[PDB]
Amino acid sequence: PASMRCHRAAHICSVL
Amino acid sequence: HMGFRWKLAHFRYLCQSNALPSHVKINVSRQTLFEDSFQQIMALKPYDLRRRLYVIFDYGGLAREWFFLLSHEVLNPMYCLFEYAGKNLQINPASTINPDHLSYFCFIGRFIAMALFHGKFIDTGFSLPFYKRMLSKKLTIKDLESIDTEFYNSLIWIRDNNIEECGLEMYFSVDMEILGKVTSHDLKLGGSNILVTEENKDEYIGLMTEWRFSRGVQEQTKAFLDGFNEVVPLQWLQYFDEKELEVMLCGMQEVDLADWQRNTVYRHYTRNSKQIIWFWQFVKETDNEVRMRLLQFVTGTCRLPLGGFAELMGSNGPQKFCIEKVGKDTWLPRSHTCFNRLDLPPYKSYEQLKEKLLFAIEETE
Ligand SMILES: *CC(=O)Nc1ccc(NC(=O)C*)cc1
């Protein structure tokens, strides 16, 4: 998905 | 809300019948106000603060000048007890730098309780989720939204998207680094060794939410509450909600309606929307107690900035009172206090809008 999910998962662990 | 004037009458009668004879004198200086109050209060036994108060720097306007001034200084980032941790307030988790921080928080809770006991107002003020903690009320995920937007957004994403197609690998433990410590925390016993899965989402969300409120501040909060409880025991606040506890401490100001109305912004609405015409008509009729409870429900506080509504601040900066159309006439209204935003559904008549506001203002958080 144009490298989707991969960037949110990295962002969610970084936040939590 | 509901019978609030009954609620405080009962409380004033509680303090008045628990008062103690004689008095306590408090000598303080203008420039050393908070070191001196700390030493004279902490030298007195807690129930001595229930006696008559004599502050020599009327013989009761000196007391009000004490409770205002000291209120500003104790919540002033200088002793490093409090961190804004919003943007432009709450307990600072780095207060451990001060070896005696727990002694200062005992004093602060004792001082807040004196204000309530003596019916005086403070000019500082904590957040609604803090007041819920004082009342032993369950903290929700909307309270999370008010303290930590970006932490709130991540937990919401886990709640209604499956984290299996995302590649998320998470566990029931969270680190936190304060002053370069990196302290791990197991949400349950042996929690670091259990993967967060789509079946146990709900719990993890709940544990993460509950842990976020008291991260690095458990000891400080426990000292504040222990000191408060010594002067005004917490169970005397039993009939109050967090919105009422804030007003009791901060006092009531009357809202300037012309200033409010001309500094309100709209999303998917206009001043020419009938839902906005009806909204402004509603606030023209209701009490000013209802107006203040509505400011609480939407902005997160009853206090108004220096400057009026033009100066309203939210998360990342200036953030004016905002109304936005969402959902349908069957929905209930709701709010996002970090954004000073009211989600006002497109109701069908004035009466439906008035009934549904008053419900949200008085009954929901
Ligand atoms: C492309 C990709 O999958 N990135 C990724 C996934 C997960 C995480 N971290 C956790 O799951 C905790 C980082 C990056």
CATH of residue B71's domain is 3.90.1750.10
Distances in Å between the Cα of B178 and the Cα atoms of B94, B95, B186, B355 are 6, 10, 17, 47
Residues B104 and B231 in one domain: yes
Distances in Å between the Cα of B274 and the Cα atoms of B22, B141, B321, B346 are 61, 32, 18, 9
3-state helix, strand, coil in chain A (%, to 5): 60, 0, 40
Residue of A nearest to B157 (CA): A12
Contacts of B294 (CB under 8 A, 6+ apart): B283, B357, B361
Q: Do B166 and A8 touch (CB under 8 A)?
A: yes
Confirm whether B338 is a catalytic residue.
yes
Compute the distance between CA of residue B284 and CA of residue B307 in angstroms, rounded to an integer. 22
- In the reported structure, the alpha carbon of residue B62 is separated from the centroid of ligand 1 by a whole-number distance in angstroms of 60
Tokens of B135: 């009342």
Residues B83 and B181 in one domain: no
Residues B159 and B104 in one domain: no
Q: Is residue B333 a contact partner of residue B345, using CB atoms and an 8 Å limit? A: yes
Compute the distance between CA of residue B348 and CA of residue B346 in angstroms, rounded to an integer. 7
DSSP states along B90-150: EE-GGGGGSTTHHHHHHHHHHHHHHHHHTT---S----HHHHHHHTTPPP-HHHHHHH-HH
Backbone angles phi, psi at B263, to 5 degrees: -115, 35
Compute the distance between CA of residue B34 and CA of residue B69 in angstroms, rounded to an integer. 9
- In the reported structure, the alpha carbon of residue B164 is separated from the centroid of ligand 1 by a whole-number distance in angstroms of 11
Cited resolution, angstroms = 2.4
Pick the last residue of a domain from B250, B267, B301: B250
Residues B234 and B109 in one domain: yes
Experimental method: X-ray
Nearest to B325 by CA among B278, B269, B261, B280: B269
Distances in Å between the Cα of B3 and the Cα atoms of B102, B104, B236, B300 are 37, 36, 16, 22
Compute the distance between CA of residue B136 and CA of residue B44 in angstroms, rounded to an integer. 28
Compute the distance between CA of residue B31 and CA of residue B54 in angstroms, rounded to an integer. 19
Q: Is residue B129 a contact partner of residue B112, using CB atoms and an 8 Å limit? A: no
- Annotated catalytic residue: which of B106, B250, B322, B338? B338
What is the domain extent for residue B187? 141-213
Residues B156 and B262 in one domain: no
* Residue linked to tokens 């912004």: B265
Give nearest CA residue, ligand 1 atom 8: A10
Number of domains making up chain B: 3
What CATH number did the domain enclosing B355 receive? 3.30.2410.10
Residues B40 and B127 in one domain: yes
Q: What does R_g of chain B's alpha carbons equal in angstroms?
A: 23
